Structure formats: C-alpha cells, structure tokens
Amino acid sequence: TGRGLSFLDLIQEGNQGLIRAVEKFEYKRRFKFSTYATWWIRQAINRAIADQARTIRIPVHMVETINKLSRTARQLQQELGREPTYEEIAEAMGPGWDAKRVEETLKIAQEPVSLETPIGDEKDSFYGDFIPDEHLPSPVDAATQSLLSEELEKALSKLSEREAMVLKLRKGLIDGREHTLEEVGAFFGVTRERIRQIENKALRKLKYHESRTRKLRDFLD
Amino acid sequence: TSVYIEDVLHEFSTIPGVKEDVVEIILNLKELVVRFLNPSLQTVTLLLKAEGPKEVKARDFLPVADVEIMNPDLHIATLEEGGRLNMEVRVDRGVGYVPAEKHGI
Amino acid sequence: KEVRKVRIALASPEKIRSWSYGEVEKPETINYRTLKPERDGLFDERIFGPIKDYECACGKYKRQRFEGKVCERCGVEVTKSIVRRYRMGHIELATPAAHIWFVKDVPSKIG
Amino acid sequence: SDPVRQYLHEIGQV
Amino acid sequence: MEIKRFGRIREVIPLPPLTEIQVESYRRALQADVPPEKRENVGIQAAFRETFPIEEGLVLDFLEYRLGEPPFPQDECREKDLTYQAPLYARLQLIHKDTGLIKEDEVFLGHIPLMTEDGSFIINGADRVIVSQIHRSPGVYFTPDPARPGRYIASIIPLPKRGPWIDLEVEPNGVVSMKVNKRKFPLVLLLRVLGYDQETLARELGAYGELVQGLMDESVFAMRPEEALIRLFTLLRPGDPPKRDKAVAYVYGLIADPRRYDLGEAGRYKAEEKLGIRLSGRTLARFEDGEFKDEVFLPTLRYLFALTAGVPGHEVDDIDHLGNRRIRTVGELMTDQFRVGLARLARGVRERMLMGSEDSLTPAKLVNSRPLEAAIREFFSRSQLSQFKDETNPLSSLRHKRRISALGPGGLTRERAGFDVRDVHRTHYGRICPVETPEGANIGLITSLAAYARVDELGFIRTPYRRVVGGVVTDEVVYMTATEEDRYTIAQANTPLEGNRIAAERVVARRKGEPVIVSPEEVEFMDVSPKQVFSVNTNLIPFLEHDDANRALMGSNMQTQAVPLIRAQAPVVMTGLEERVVRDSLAALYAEEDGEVAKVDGNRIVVRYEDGRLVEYPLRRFYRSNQGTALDQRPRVVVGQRVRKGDLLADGPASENGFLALGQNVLVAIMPFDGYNFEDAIVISEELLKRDFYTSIHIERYEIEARDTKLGPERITRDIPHLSEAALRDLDEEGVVRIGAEVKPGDILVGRTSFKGESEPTPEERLLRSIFGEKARDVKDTSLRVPPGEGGIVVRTVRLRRGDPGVELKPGVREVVRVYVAQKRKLQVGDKLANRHGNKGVVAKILPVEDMPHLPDGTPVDVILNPLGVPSRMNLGQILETHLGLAGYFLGQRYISPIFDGAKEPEIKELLAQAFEVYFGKRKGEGFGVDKREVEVLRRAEKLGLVTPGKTPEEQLKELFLQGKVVLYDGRTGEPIEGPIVVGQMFIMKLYHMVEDKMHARSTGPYSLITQQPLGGKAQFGGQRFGEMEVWALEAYGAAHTLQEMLTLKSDDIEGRNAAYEAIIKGEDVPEPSVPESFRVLVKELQALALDVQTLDEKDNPVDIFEGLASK
Amino acid sequence: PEWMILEAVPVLPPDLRPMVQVDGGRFATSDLNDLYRRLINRNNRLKKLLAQGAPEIIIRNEKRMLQEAVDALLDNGRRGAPVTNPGSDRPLRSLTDILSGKQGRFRQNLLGKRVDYSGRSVIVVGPQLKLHQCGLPKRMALELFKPFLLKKMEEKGIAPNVKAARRMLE
Amino acid sequence: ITQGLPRVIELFEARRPKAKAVISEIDGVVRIEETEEKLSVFVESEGFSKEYKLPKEARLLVKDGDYVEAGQPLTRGAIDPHQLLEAKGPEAVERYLVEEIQKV
DNA sequence: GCATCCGTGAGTCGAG
DNA sequence: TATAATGGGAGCTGTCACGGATGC
Ligand SMILES: [Mg+2]
Ligand SMILES: [Zn+2]
C-alpha cells in the first residue's frame, strides 16, 4: 500500500498473479502451492505498480532506473548527512552516469500536479485560475492578422491581376499550399523561367511600393 | 537639484567610513542655502572633497565666485578614520517646489 | 436559425456512442519523452482532434487545403484544433454500471 | 459499507 | 526633549519577554542544549519514546537523538531560498530476539527547522511564524443535556487525534449508554470487561436513588470478562471475526494503549482534580496481569450520577472558561506532526522487517527517513497555522508571534463557530486581549495574548496578581490560571495606597469576575497593572479609556500596518511601552556590555568592551521585508562614545532613538474643509512632501529562469531580436540591467531569448518575408520587463548559474536571475493614514501651503481632520492627544500617559496655560497687539459661551487656549474661521494600503484555459469580476445590451471579443455577439454526465451551437 | 428507464480537462484524468479477468470496484469514501463538483464572469465634480479605452497605424 | 427588543415558528376550562365543538365567551402561515406575511 | 399519527 | 519462475435549519 495503487487494486493484480501461478504450477516438485504462488503474486503487484501509478506512463525499465536513482540518492544522503548533488549521485551510479544524465533522468521523472490544487486558507482560488491560455490567439493577434491580410491585398492590387495571381499561387495565399514554378507556368500557360521572371518583377514592384509608402514595415515586428 | 558622489551608484547606497547613508546626506543637502550674487547666473556645481576623521559641514565646499553659502554650520556628514567623501552638487534657480521625479536633473 | 428552447434528457448508450469520435482504450495521457498524445489514450489526436490547426500528428498534411481529410499514416483529421474542446470520446464497459445520480438522489428513481 | 471489509468476508467463506 | 510622565501606579514587575510564548515553547520541544541522558520525556523525545520500540522476531529500539549545526546561517538561508535547519540523527539498535545479535548505528533522519532569535522561522527563504492554537483542554467534562433538563452528558475528551470522544448519557429508558466512534451501547458491558462485579457497583453507586438500577443488567453479570469482551467486540465490529486476541488488541488500542490513546498532562491533571482521584498514566484503563483494570470510568460514572441526583459539590462545566481552554504552541504542533511522520516511518520499518535478508539488516537499511521529512516539510509549508511572517514593521512581527487562533487542524471550522467561542469570557481578563481581534468573519476567532500573560507548562494562560495580607500589598506576585483566580477576591490596580497599605475604606474588586465593593480586610490579591488587561498593540493607544472599544480595535490593528518612514518619529503622547516594543522585537541594536565605541560606519559599529575585546556589529541596510518594506539599521552612536550595558547602538526600522516610531507627529486642525475631508477623507499640506514626511522606501524582487527545453535552451543575453540600442541602453554585457539604472514600465530588467515553437508560417508570413528579405530568426524575445505601474532604481542583481560553485538548481533550469528594484514613495492622493484611536482615512487633497489654514504667527497646519468623524465613533482619545500635543508643541516636550493612569484634564490645562504663555507673551514682547480678526472671533466665541464677557482679549484667548482652541485664518482669504478651531499635534501613521499598489486596469489580456474568461488579479493583468450581484444591478436597470456585452463580448465569446476589438480599432461599432464559450463547456460537461442538452428553435428542431465541428 | 444504467461512459473533450505545461516546464492537469484512468484500468482488468475465466469472487470484486470508479468519476464522495490522490487528503474534483456549488460552473462562470475593459482603484471625495461626473486617472483611462485610443491616434498623425500606436503605448 | 432578520427569514421561508400561537380552525364561541394543573380552550359552534389543549402558562388572546373568526389567534405567538392558509384562505396569508415582514 | 438519520445549504469584491 | 508464506487499518469531532424519506 501507499505506492500509488489502492488496496483493492493491488489485491486484484495479485489475483491475476495467482491465476498465472495456478496455470504454471507443477505438483510433482512436492512444493507447497504458496511458495510458487508468492513469486507470481509479487511479480504481478510490482508490474501493476510500475505500469499504472504515474499519470504520465513510464516504461518499466525506466521506472526501475528511476527507483535505483532514488535508493542511491537516499543511501548517499544517509551517509553524507545532507541531500547529495547531481555529481555525487553520478559518482555512486557508476560508469556511463554523468551529472547531466542524473539531471535529465530526474526531469523525465517529474509527475504532474493538480490544476485543482487550492490556493489560500478559505478555498476561494484554484491553481488553474492562474494559467493563461497560450494556444487560442488573442484579440490583438487576430486583429493584426486581419489587418495584415487586408494590407497585403491593398499592396497586391497595385500589381496586374496576373502578377498578383502568380505571387498568390507561389506563396500559398489561394489554396493554402505553394506551387512549383512548373505548376504556375502550366496554369498560366508560360515557361517556368517566364513565371519566375514575372514573380521576380512582381516582388520588385512590391519592394518599390513598400519603400515608397512604408505601409507594411510595422508588421515585420 | 542634483548630487553625484564617487563610488555611489544610486540613492539607496552607503559610503564606507561615513555614518549617514546617502538618503540622509541628500536630506541634509536639501537644507543648503546658496545665494547667487550675479543675477545672470543660473546654475552652479559646488564641489566637496573631505577625508579622515571630521564632521563635514557646508563650509567645506570649495568657494565659487559670486556664490555665498548662507548657512556654513549646516552639518552634512560624519566621516571616520579612512572615511572619504567626494561630491558634486548642482544648484539651480527656480520657483516653488519641483520634486525630483519631475525634473530628473 | 435562432435558439428559443433548451431541452435536457437522458442519453441512450447508442446516443453516447453517436457522440463519441472513438473509444479510449488505454489509460495513457502523453508520451514521457516526446510529450505528444499517446495512441488510444485520453488525449489521442486520432479521436479528439489535431493539436495544431489543420495539421495532423505526423505532419503529412499541414495546410487548410485538406479539410476533413483523414490521414492514412496517423489517422488524424485535419480541421481547426478548437475541436479538441468539442469532441466526445467514450469507454465501452464490460459490465453495465449505474449512474449514481439516479441511485443516491432520494427518493431513488431506479428504486 | 466498507468494500475491503466486504471482500475480506467473501474471502473468509472459502 | 524633556519627557514628562504621568500616573501614580508603580508597576512591581516588568513585562515578560514578549516572544517567550514562541521561543520557550520551541526550546522545550527540542531540548537541543540538554545532554541526551538529561532530556525529559516531553517534546520530540516523547515522540521517539512513543513510536519505539518496533517489534515483529526482529526488534528496533530507540537509544537517543542529537541535533547538529545548521549547514547554513540564517542570512545565507534567506538569500539562497533555503531553510534554516539542523540535521537530526537518531541512535538505533536492531536486536534479534532468538539470535541475540545487536547491530547499532546512528541513522540520519533529515532536517528540523530552527527558530531564529526573535521567534520566527526561515522556510524556503521566507520568514514564517507558527501561530498558537486555542482549543478545548482534554479531560472529563459534564454538560447539561439540552433535550432532557434533568440529565447531563459526560464527555471524556483526549488530546486531538489521540483517541475517541467518549460520551456517557442517562437514557430515557434508564440504562446508561456509552457513545464512542458514534456507537451507543450499555456501559454495563464495559464495566464488566474492566473486572467489576455487581457487588462493587452496588456498594459504590447504590447511594444514588435508583440510578444504579439502570446499571443493573443480569445478562451481563451472567458472563465472565472474556465473554463480555467478545460481546463488546462484536458490538463494535460488525462482520469482523470475534477472535479473542483480536478483541483484546482492539479494546486495548481503544482505551488503554498509551501509544494510541493520550490525554494531556493537562487532561490528566484536570481529570484528577475534577473527579477527585489519582491517575497512574494518561489513559482510561490499563492492561495488568492479563486482564484490564479501570482508571477513569467508575469515578466519571460516580460523578455523573451524583450530578444527576443533585448532591452538593458537583457542578456542570463552562467549556469557554480559560480553565478548560488551553493553548497549543509551536512546540506542541510541531511535535504532533513529528509524531505522525515517525508513525509513518515505523510502518515502513515493520514493512521492511517482514521482507529482506533476516540476518544482515542494519538500522540504515530499515529506516526510510522520507515520510518524517515529508511530514515536517508539509507542516512548515502548508499548515493553516504556518503563516507568512508579517514584518511590515517590528510591531507587526511581535503581534503576529502573539496571535491565538481557534482555526486550523484540530480547531474549529469556518461557520462552525457560534457566539460562545467568539465572546470575550470573564476569564479572558488579563489573559486574552478584549479589543485586538479582526473585524469581519474571523472576529473572536483570532485574538492576541495579553501583555503580562503567560502560558504555563500545561498550556493554560496565566496572569499575574499581587498578594494582599491584612490590607498590605506585598511585592510577591503570583501567576494564576482562571481556575485559581476564581478562588480569590482581587482588587483593581488603581486602589489608593499609602506605602503598601490600602488607603480606601471601600475597594473595587472581582469575585469570579463579578464586580463588588469590598473591605480592605477582604482583599486577597490585587491587579499588577491596567496594562495587563490588553495586548501590546492596544497598550500603545494613549487615552484608551476615552475611546469606544470598536474604534480602539481598529486603532490597535492598524499599528500593525504602519509603514517604516525614512524620518519616523515616536509619538509626542506615548503610553510608556514604545521602548520595550523596540527592544523585544530585536529590530534595534544594543550594547552587550559596558564599553567604548571604537568605530562607527553606515555599515558597521565596532565596540571595545570591558573585557578588552573588539566586537563588530554589522548593520542590516536596505533589506527587503516579507511585505517589501525596507528594514535598515542606522547608527545612533559616534566614535569615542562611552556606552553602558543595554545602551542603544543602532536604530532599527520605524524606531527613533529606541522608541517605537510608526508615523509622524503632525500639526492638525479639526474642521471641515470644502468637502475635501468629507466622509473620513483627509486634507494634507504639500509642506509634508517638501520635508519628506510620510515618505517610505519599498523594494520589489523580480525573478527569471532560463531552463532547458526540448526545442533548445533558453538563454539570458543582451542579444534580443528586433530591439534598438534605446531598448538595451541600461543592459549590461550579459543581458542584465545595471545597478543604479532607472526602470519604468516596459523596460527590460533581464534579457532572455527562447527558441520558437515549431513554426508553420502562414502564407502572409512567407509573402511579407519575401517582400522584406529577412530570414525569420530562430529565437524570440521572452525578456523580463517591468510590470505596468511599477519601477524604480535597480539596487541589486543576483545571478546563479548551473555549473557554478555552491549552486544547484531544480532539474532543467540553466540559470536564475533576480533583480531587486527599490523605489522611494512620497505620500500621494489615495494613500491611507490613521491614528492610534481608529481614525482612518484616505488623502483626498494635497493643497499648496498658502491654501492651508494657519495660525496668527503664520504657522500653517499639516493635515485637516473633519470633526464629523468624532461623535458617532466615540473615540475621544484623539482629542485629548491633540490638546496635549498642542501643549507639548509650544513647550517643546513629549509625554508619557499610561493608559488608565492617564494625564487628566487639569494637568493638561496647566501645560496648556504654560504653552499659551510661550505662544502669546512672545507676541506681546515683540510689539504686536491683538488682531482685529481675533476680535471678531472673540465676539463669536463670546456668543458661544466659550469665554467670559468683559475679560481682556489676552484673557479670553487664554480661556480658549485652555479649551485647546485657537484663532485660525483661512489661507485663501485672510479672513478668520468664524469660530475658534481645535489645533494641536497628533500622531498619524501611513498604512500599507497605498494607491500605488492597488490601481489596475485592463483592455484585453490573458484568458483562463477551460472557461476562456479573463484571468483574475492585478499580478496576472486580469479583469474585474462582474459577479451575480453586478448582473442583478444591470438587470434591475434594464440595461440588457450592457449585460449581454459583459456576458459575451468582454469575457468568453471568442469570436465576439476578437471581432469587437477589430471593430474598435477599425472605427466600427461592435458586432452582435454570439454564444459564450462557457455555455459550450456547460453543454459538454453535461454530456459527460450522460445528459443530452439540446438547443432548439421554436419549431423544436435542434440548433448546433458547435457549428458542425462536433457532429460526425 | 434502462438508460439510467450506463453501458458506454462518455469521455469529456480533452481541452476541458487540460494537460498543460506551466511556466517552469512542468505539467499541471485536471483530476478528471486520474478518475478516467482509474475507470479504464479497472475496466480493462475486468475485460481480461473475463477473457481468462476467473472465479466468481474475483469478478464480483472487479465489478464492485468498477461501479465505484464510475461513481467517483461522476460524483465523488457521494457514496463511500472520496477518491483522493496519493499523499493528500484532498478529494478529487468530479463532474458534479464542477457543476454545483459556489465555485461550480453555473455560479462562477455563467451567472457572472470576469470581464475585459475593466479596472479598479481607491476612491476619493472630489467635491468639485458635478453629479454626473467622476474623476478617472489618466493611465486607467488609457488602458480602458486602448483600442479607441489606437484608432484616434491613427486618425491623427500620432502613429502610422494601429500596431505602431500600440507599440508606442507599450 | 425585536426579532429582526431571523424573523424576516422565518417569514420568507413560510416556516412554522418555534413559539407559535394556536389558532381556531372554525368559528365559534370560547369556553375556557382551567384546572389548577391543566388548561384547555373550547371553541363551540352551533352544532360543532373543537378543543385546544395547551400548556398552563400560555397567554390567552381571548376572553371567555367571545366569538372568534376561523384562524383568529387564541394564544399569543407567531401564526403558522400554513394553518392560517387552511383556516382563513390565501388573502389572509398574504395580509399576514406582508404586515409581519413590514413590522420588522 | 411521531422521533430519527442523511443530504444540503450557510454574502460580495480584492490578494493569496 | 519452486523452503513456506493464506482476512486491513484509519476514523477524529464545539453548526444550524430546512426538507423529508424510513421506523414506532
Ligand atoms: Mg559515475
Ligand atoms: Zn498524418
């Protein structure tokens, strides 16, 4: 108990181990059943503790390495009268273990914490109430994106519709993907050198318009 | 209107061998009374340099032409054996009460 | 059309399965190394949706040109990632289980 | 009332 | 100046050490200085002795323990975010019963936090205070049954979490029932298990009329103790097999196991005194020679029946008596959590004893210290009673250490406390302050230790009195509990005395708290001082007897909130306690022995003592407190000075020459001023800012971490993309701002770059990139800038790095950078001021000096207080303080006015006459007569009956001055105030609630994860909560569109808020909102409950608010 | 009526029970994940113990534990002991606890919300104001009206566009 | 010496008071029967009779031989609003609740 | 008709 | 994969006042 699984969960996993022991027992060896059953029972209990206790599941060999690191640090602190540094632990772990490896193994073993962890004496606050949402764009971001699209269309209208269309096809404004020169040339019916040339001249006219009006500079961050 | 002290980066510091902190030194310098004899004079930078055991007063300022310190007994600092003080205080003409946060001189 | 009423009623197991975009088979959240959602787990993009907008898990289709297209390699639909707030999953139970609301709210409705 | 007590009783029958 | 003091009471004893409740308790708990063989069975020694030995075979026993030295000093712990603690070792020995082999070793158990000299702790680099708890003392109580008027409930109560509450009741059917773990059963059964027989019960309880007959059950005596024991075990454990040894084990653990059941030593003593018996141990029964033997049950049943019958000498108990309520101090709480951690360690020990190689097991292999470490760390970090230290000023820390809470683990729950727990009991006299307590919900639950009060070894609060023999007051003083106090007739400390003899024929005294007029022959004890009735904060309020208690409460609590001013002054009217507060708080520095001062610096003071030794005292200079208020010591001696033992060497924060200096002494006029002091607002003179009165230094800490990522390392650097030299001006080579720089909102404190997320550039990004021909950089600006509305002068930078000596950070981070920024705050419109009498207000107007009301000699007042705040609040002490402050303003002196030994009105009048001499004879000598405006004001005052008619102008001005009133001229007009105004010197503090910290505003910002609603709090740049009641306001106004706009466009309508922001920046009206996201969350969370929620139109046909994104 | 008995337990969309990386690079997550994990572990173990033909006592215990798992998921602490994470007395937050109470969904996020374009500060008497007036600090009003201010700055010459004005106000 | 907000809540919740007044279920005339030990009050109609037994120390709002309305208080105390509703009807309860809250 | 046990509630905003 | 090992361990606490379903 107290290793991350309920009493009943441990009991059911030991029941699975007991079923295995039953199906693998050989009475001919004159051994009592308990001696063979205890092996599989401990085996199943430990497999369950290793496989289910963590909210972020860790492979069983990695959990064994983590527990070895735990025991090692605990013996080192029981002999040192203080918590050991990464370097002392890497020493005691043997070869192939440098301090950076101990640090990475500890970072990989960090368990998550509850978003419902309380803050304060009277339960008026949660821990999740301080986590900003980074994924969904802010109104400022969406507004800047819309103004960018509108300014790019404002600048793309100063081109002819063909050079504007070539730029839009080549950069992905139209269908979401960027086409090769051969595809834009097969669409407009022109050589890849010609389509790349009108792309260059459209970019050049846009560069001139931008040096003149400076309307798109502020969007470059 | 302004103070510079050598080996002092800001107002919340202390100078070794000196009893008062810089906050108290500026509080004392606020009470300095400087008279301008030339009417065309706008700003002056008084210079002070003292050391060893002493009690630096407003007299210790190096005299300037057309500038008279009206309270030479005003205490400024209590310097100890090895204590050293080296100040440049800027004094201006003005009207009323202008806090430091407004003129930033 | 405009909303005028709000109905609330019991959900049949068939209704629950009609909601679900996939059964959650494993009690696993995200890989301890890649920090990406595990397969058949509680955060599987194959069920609930892409984590990034219009990009599947492996990255074969990353643009808006594919909308509704289900990938062959990773099996993740390419749509807006906002759907990860809206797509139910389900758990198919071995034995039926009683909804405690209809058991312990006295007087018991089942009782 | 206590599921582990219930199970320990069920175990005590065999 | 001269300090004239009043009062005739000579205090026989000084105030005890004000932090002794903390320091002595923890000292008693640890016994670190006691050699182990000399340690007592209390403290953590008791925890060890209770947990050990550990059996089953194998046996692990306890020998002793020892505490090492702290690996780091207190200051280094404060800086490195460490804990000031000592290593805990325990000598253990494993013994195999059969083998006899004994392996002994000293195992390491972790660390125990040490208490600092002033009584606080340093946990993870922050000072913390363990607040004492108040609770019901263990023992046996008899309370009236509320249902049955003639019957009584007996209650046996052990220490918290040390056993079950046991109730004995006389049932309506006659049989006496016992309730334990919420199980009622006839007590006769347990009496049988104890070995009692009907003969003994009949001869003991037969004297009570037919009450013993409810105890007579034949089916119980028809069975031996074993059969009754198994009967009880079956009655207590349904379904559990009624084994014999299991029944003995459970019953022993329930009643007789000292390692499971434990009354207090207090509970032991109280049960002994109440029932009139003696106890061998702290349990209800014992296991002796294979059977059970009773200790408590029969005496309790006897007392219960005697009380029910009505025999004399038996009385119900008052559970709010301070003889039945006790205090759990730091030692007891820490020892409890230590005992819990030790029990967990012992469970682990037995677990390992079952497994493993039975032959080779050292103690080190058996003891996993981690549960004990975890229990201790959890107690000191996340206990309801382990509070962030309040070090706003020295008095804050002191009062905090003297708090008493009824809340917390083992205490009372919120809303579970009625009027009784919150009332001030008659026994609080001299023990718990009757005035210092919070307003609001916690009133009467958080209280404060009285000044002369002490907590004894059993945990009851004791107060001192003086012996009175034959009307003679001895100097012998006796500390009593309330139980002892109720035995005597105790006179008031103000009874007249000629020498040591009671001078009056009639004496005012208390008998069991009741007031009575009594003869000097009848007086047994006498109060030590009025000071002993109140807390330390309350004892700092002069003229307390003239203040209503509800406002004295505020005046007391608000001194805790006084900000240390750069020019702090002790009040001109003190109570005689302002020096001990500075001393016991350890803020100021004193002289350890008589000596001569060798060196004096802004940073150090070196003293040569009589021993010839040279002791150097470093001065804490500009240190940031828990609340950010600057704690700096300043030297008050000079080189070559002679100093005796206890002389002042340095002034602590909020200290003036060793006197508690929480504010300024300002010149106050009491009059309305054009509505700028309306409803407790305050008008102040700009002069106060000119001389830097009410100016305070505040330091803020900023922190940043550069860590390792799966996308590359974050790194602190001056190379931040897309920023000019204008942005990087004050940044050093490494990317940290320079010491001494001025930082405003938006300025970079520490530069930092972070590798971008896996970037799929939108087509607009690719096209703009091609237009401007610049590769999108690999990193992004994540620099720590200055929050909105903050800033100052950079005074410190700390940089810790991985791979550097003495440094090891949490796994993953490369480096940590801290920037300490200080700011000097003048008083501004919106800051909060208060006096010690509960007059609190906000500065609403700062007039230029020429607009200020002024005296005839051209002296302008400092602050204008509105008189309308006086009458309803009934706090007149501020008036008398203003009067005596006027007197001491013109005489140039201060005063000591003990609280109820105050300066009376006639003496204040004498001093005011002398002050008027100084104020007016000066004028008459300088060659000036009485002013015409003074004549007009004198006519007005003559109509008011303030001056007698026909006296001279000077005589009438003196008549007014003795009333504390003066002529005052309006600064804007020159005309006088039509009446004479009360002007004088008053002590006013600047409180911590400064508008600079509180102003906040947000257009848009961060939103919460699930709800997509704005975060809360100023620190998160959050939005204001528009709660249910604000919604009711908008509904009652019928402002439908404003309300809908709150519920959608400004909170969690994602599309709505985005479109609204775009419309406003474009110049268009905001669009009609759509469905808020939190309702979608509601719908989905109801779906997760297997409830189909359907939005329908008027045709009852479904409507999809998820716009298809949820339907397959 | 039989719909009051569950065959297929629904699973909440993962964003409403997040698994998010906080500032320091560590992870914070909702209790619903641990409740669902309990449920799925017990249900999978039941499916296996059925596939392997286990005795009656064992399958009975497994089914009892499965019911109590579902109960903790839907309304924890309602029946029996509340399900707590290891090393903590704190009950886990089920769906019932998310809906009902002071802090529940209805009262906390639906009948009242935190809101944009809002501020607060200390009040002050200001007797010069007419009845229909109040004194609003300049910085408060700048932030509260920020988009209007960007628009009006673009209308004048104070900034080339909205984004430049915002960077200038930063 | 008033009941206050607790009384207001007791009213808005239509709760049956602790120290309640006994009211008559019908019309009739009052015949008091007071033994030195026990006390009762009879309300007698022209063909009916009702009996209300009450504690000895209860104060009477009625003089012997008086004609009382259905739902009229006989004892001093707060009326149970539900008893008043059954005896006298809805308008009576509305009047009673409004006046009782307004008293506070 | 009447005690008794169990579930449900017990103010707002603000900083933590 | 084999000596034999065969039923647990913590509650835990000074509250009203309703509604309001189960036992005499
Ligand atoms: Mg190594
Ligand atoms: Zn894919």
Side-chain angles (χ1 to χ4, degrees), chain C residues 1-11 15-22 32-36 52-55 62 80 82-83 85-88 99 101-102, chain E residues 710 758 760 1008-1012 1054 1075 1077 1079-1081 1084 1086-1100 1102-1103 1105-1112:
Chain C
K1 295 305 178 181
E2 174 197 40
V3 179
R4 295 293 307 269
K5 313 172 186 179
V6 170
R7 187 180 60 209
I8 182 182
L10 291 191
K15 171 89 63 180
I16 295 160
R17 298 188 195 105
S18 65
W19 293 341
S20 175
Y21 270 71
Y32 85 110
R33 277 190 302 181
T34 74
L35 297 186
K36 282 305 165 68
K52 309 173 193 68
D53 285 285
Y54 299 114
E55 174 179 351
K62 290 186 176 181
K80 300 122 77 177
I82 189 93
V83 307
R85 319 175 98 267
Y86 306 149
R87 291 193 179 186
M88 302 289 288
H99 194 318
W101 274 14
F102 310 92
Chain E
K710 302 198 171 297
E758 45 196 87
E760 175 188 325
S1008 209
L1009 275 164
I1010 300 174
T1011 61
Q1012 287 305 324
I1054 310 170
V1075 167
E1077 182 72 3
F1079 177 65
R1080 299 200 183 111
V1081 171
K1084 282 303 168 182
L1086 277 165
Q1087 277 187 5
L1089 265 329
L1091 296 182
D1092 187 8
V1093 164
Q1094 288 274 12
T1095 58
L1096 320 172
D1097 46 50
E1098 81 297 328
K1099 288 256 195 171
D1100 297 336
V1103 174
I1105 65 173
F1106 301 93
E1107 310 188 319
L1109 283 73
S1111 46
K1112 299 178 289 186

Side-chain angles (χ1 to χ4, degrees), chain E residues 236-422:
Chain E
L236 263 28
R237 309 280 300 192
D240 201 312
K243 202 173 186 60
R244 192 269 187 183
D245 46 300
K246 192 172 191 182
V248 171
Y250 176 79
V251 146
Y252 172 85
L254 199 77
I255 260 62
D257 189 15
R259 308 163 71 159
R260 278 189 81 189
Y261 192 98
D262 198 14
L263 303 167
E265 200 69 20
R268 187 179 181 277
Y269 161 82
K270 283 202 79 284
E272 288 175 357
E273 207 80 3
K274 177 61 172 177
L275 304 179
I277 66 177
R278 195 69 168 96
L279 254 294
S280 60
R282 298 192 287 252
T283 56
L284 308 181
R286 308 162 307 167
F287 191 86
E288 202 178 298
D289 309 300
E291 49 181 357
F292 290 109
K293 299 194 182 307
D294 182 26
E295 283 278 7
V296 179
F297 281 93
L298 178 68
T300 297
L301 181 60
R302 198 273 314 172
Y303 200 110
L304 172 63
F305 281 168
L307 177 66
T308 305
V311 337
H314 303 59
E315 6 114 271
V316 132
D317 301 311
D318 187 352
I319 69 165
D320 295 316
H321 208 274
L322 285 198
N324 301 329
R325 281 177 107 206
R326 59 177 305 271
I327 300 298
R328 321 182 70 202
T329 50
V330 202
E332 188 173 344
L333 307 173
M334 189 283 302
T335 301
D336 270 21
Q337 288 314 106
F338 195 84
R339 187 170 300 118
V340 173
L342 240 49
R344 291 168 188 165
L345 176 138
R347 213 284 298 199
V349 156
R350 262 173 297 258
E351 206 155 57
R352 288 175 177 85
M353 283 204 310
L354 293 191
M355 325 275 82
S357 302
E358 291 277 312
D359 178 48
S360 54
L361 281 185
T362 48
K365 290 181 186 171
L366 247 45
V367 169
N368 183 8
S369 65
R370 268 53 177 84
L372 169 68
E373 305 178 65
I376 291 172
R377 184 162 51 253
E378 135 241 288
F379 173 70
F380 276 95
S381 298
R382 273 159 290 282
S383 180
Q384 172 100 353
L385 295 172
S386 175
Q387 302 175 355
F388 208 68
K389 183 190 198 182
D390 185 17
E391 48 182 6
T392 305
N393 64 70
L395 183 60
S396 334
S397 310
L398 190 53
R399 184 204 83 148
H400 195 169
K401 291 155 193 156
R402 297 177 67 93
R403 296 251 85 175
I404 300 169
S405 180
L407 315 167
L412 292 121
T413 320
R414 190 53 113 282
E415 295 116 45
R416 229 161 59 121
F419 286 78
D420 312 341
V421 217
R422 304 185 167 181

